[PDB]
Design a protein around this ligand. Structure first.
Ligand SMILES: Nc1nc2c(ncn2[C@@H]2O[C@H](COP(=O)(O)OP(=O)(O)OP(=O)(O)O)[C@@H](O)[C@H]2O)c(=O)[nH]1
Lengths: 76, 292, 99, 50, 49, 49
């Protein structure tokens, strides 16, 4: 829409803002302080719209994305 | 039962290891004399070998008498063997690992479930020692337990190509082995090794202890090296021959470097992936015993 | 066991599980003979319906072997269970009833 | 005189299973349907067994 | 002493062991199976393997 | 399409909590009448801004 000149900050901010509002990552919030959320597999599953087996596994059991030990996040 | 001598079972003339060469039955050492080495720019540096797993795979209920020796020797030097992990009868060695088991490892290299008439067999204690390590060959395939198939070969190089100085140093140049040779020499060597009664060598390597063990390690060093030579030819990237004044010198390059190659070739016996994991596990165990 | 090819996608697939349960009730003996081969279908069930719990369960071990003193020792290793194991020391781990 | 320990056992079994099918996440609408139908068919098997 | 391999030398030997298969083996026979097609085409997954 | 994306990111359905707050699924799923007797509500009709 702006082939030759910079995108005005107004339009860039409003568009990035509304697109940002559109995104939502499947997750189950928890109390234990040791958990981390597997951002890679979360956003990846979201991008394929939860069709690949990792996407299915995630849309069915979002709690799988939480991990204490970093490696076990994937082993699970 | 065969009583084990003050030396190993290898002291007996019944278990002599001798590759055919120049129209006679050469001892492996006087074949190793024929070997010569072209050093290259690369260095082999031996890392410490990881300790073999405590786990001994289950010897599942097999009614029959497994021919363990033939299997090990063909997974190691066989001209046609493949999918050595598929049947998984190496685990059967574990049946011998128990105290007071009724199983016997016969000189034939069979594992009988029961002591049986007119079949001579090794002393069950020593065999329990040998099984106590080599039953772990049964988990050469399982993902948790596979050996490195790259690093261990540096050790092979040192124990084969190494000079006493390079050996004590623990680091040698990668070498290109060679020997004046006859037609089909590597196949003939390997078939002459597949015939070896290696369980004698293995049982003595596991059972003997103290000075009596140490004399074994010197006396049978060349045997070990011959097996090592067949393996190293199995993984060598290429095995060229050189013409030189109406004499041909076979040259394998390189000793001590696993190329992982699995495509067949007329020159030498070939490892499928399964035989790579097998030989690598076998080497882990055999060297772990060899250095102590 | 006459092998079932169920993949357990639809909720209706619970039928197969119930068919095992009834079989475990009407015929505990025969069930006890085929239980590992039915465990192989139950694993495809648990991995699809309870992936987290399945991960932990399998991570403990797919099978075990009771010893002297009667304690169980799980393999720590997921693997398919052949009937060739029925004559062995090994047991399917689903039926250990160990919490 | 009236209760059957066996049939009551099966009742707790189908109750457990009904909770299982109920807790099942599904995405397809038809799967959502067969979920509730599975629940009804269980509740009918219970009476067969009884 | 191990025996000399027969192919190693130039003499002809007219009595030799030959391995062979008893009736119990058989090879090259057609074998039967039970194919079981997937319950739904939409439930199959391709990636990630 | 833009407002729809923003809407359905919140969730295709919701359930009332015991505290009476709404809790949207966050998932985009087609509704079935099997859900009419469920805890679930169509999210279009929540009237939540
Ligand atoms: N799709 C996706 N890729 C990721 C994510 N995190 C890391 N990666 C990718 O993983 C690759 C290797 O990860 P790292 O070792 O952590 O980082 P790197 O190799 O130095 O690469 P960069 O940090 O991206 O420059 C990188 O190329 C990243 O693109 C993630 O959350 N999602």
């Amino acid at each position: 829409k702006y082939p030759s000149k910079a995108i005005p900050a107004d339009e860039l901010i409003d568009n990035l803002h509304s697109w940002m509002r559109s995104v939502h990552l499947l997750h189950v919030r928890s109390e234990d302080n040791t958990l981390r959320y597997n951002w890679m597999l979360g956003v990846y599953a979201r991008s394929t719209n939860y069709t690949t087996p990792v996407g299915q596994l995630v849309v069915n059991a979002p709690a799988i994305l939480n991990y204490s030990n970093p490696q076990d996040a994937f082993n699970s | 039962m065969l009583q084990q001598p003050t030396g190993g079972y290898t002291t007996l003339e019944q278990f002599a290891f001798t590759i055919r060469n120049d129209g006679t039955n050469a001892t492996p050492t006087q074949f190793l004399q024929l070997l010569s080495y072209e050093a290259t720019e690369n260095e082999l540096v031996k890392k410490t070998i990881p300790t073999p797993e405590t786990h001994l795979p289950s010897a599942r209920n097999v009614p029959g008498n497994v021919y363990i020796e033939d299997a090990i020797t063909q997974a190691l030097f066989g001209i046609s063997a493949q999918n050595v992990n598929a049947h998984g009868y190496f685990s059967r060695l574990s049946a011998l690992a128990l105290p007071n088991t009724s199983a016997r490892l016969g000189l034939d290299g069979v594992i009988y479930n029961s002591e049986t008439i007119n079949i001579p067999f090794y002393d069950p204690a020593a065999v329990a020692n040998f099984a106590a390590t080599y039953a772990k060959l049964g988990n050469a395939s399982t993902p948790r337990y596979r050996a490195d198939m790259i690093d261990i070969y540096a050790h092979v190089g040192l124990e084969l190509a190494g000079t006493d100085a390079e050996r004590a140093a623990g680091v040698m140049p990668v070498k290109r082995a060679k020997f004046d040779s006859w037609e089909g020499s590597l196949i003939s060597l390997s078939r002459d090794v597949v015939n070896w009664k290696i369980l004698a060598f293995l049982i003595d390597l596991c059972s003997l202890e103290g000075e009596a063990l140490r004399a074994f390690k010197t006396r049978n060093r060349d045997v070990f090296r011959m097996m090592l030579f067949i393996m190293s030819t199995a993984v060598a990237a290429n095995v060229v021959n050189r013409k030189v004044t109406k004499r041909v010198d076979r040259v394998l390059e390189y000793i001590g470097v696993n190329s992982m190659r699995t495509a067949g070739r007329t020159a030498t016996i070939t490892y499928d992936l399964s035989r790579h994991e097998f030989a690598a596990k076998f080497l882990q165990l055999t060297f772990t015993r060899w250095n102590a | 066991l006459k092998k079932i090819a169920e993949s357990f996608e639809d909720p209706s697939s619970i039928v197969v599980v119930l068919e095992f349960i009834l079989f475990a009730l009407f015929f505990p003996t025969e069930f006890n003979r085929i239980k590992g081969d039915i465990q192989n279908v139950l694993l495809l069930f648990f991995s699809r319906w309870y992936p987290v719990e399945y991960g932990i369960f399998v991570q403990r071990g797919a099978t075990y072997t009771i010893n002297a003193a009667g304690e169980f020792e799980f393999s720590g290793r997921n693997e398919k269970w052949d009937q060739a194991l029925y004559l062995s020391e090994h047991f399917p781990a689903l039926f250990s009833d160990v919490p | 005189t009236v209760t059957n320990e066996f049939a009551s056992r099966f009742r707790t079994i189908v109750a457990t299973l009904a909770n299982v099918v109920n807790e099942r996440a599904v995405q397809d609408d038809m799967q959502k349907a067969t979920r509730s139908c599975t629940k009804q068919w269980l509740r009918h098997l219970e009476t067969q067994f009884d | 002493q191990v025996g000399i391999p027969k192919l190693e030398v130039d003499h002809i030997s007219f009595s030799n062991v030959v391995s062979m298969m008893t009736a119990n083996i058989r090879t090259g026979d057609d074998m039967a199976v039970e194919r079981v097609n997937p319950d739904d085409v939409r439930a199959i997954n391709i990636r990630n393997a």
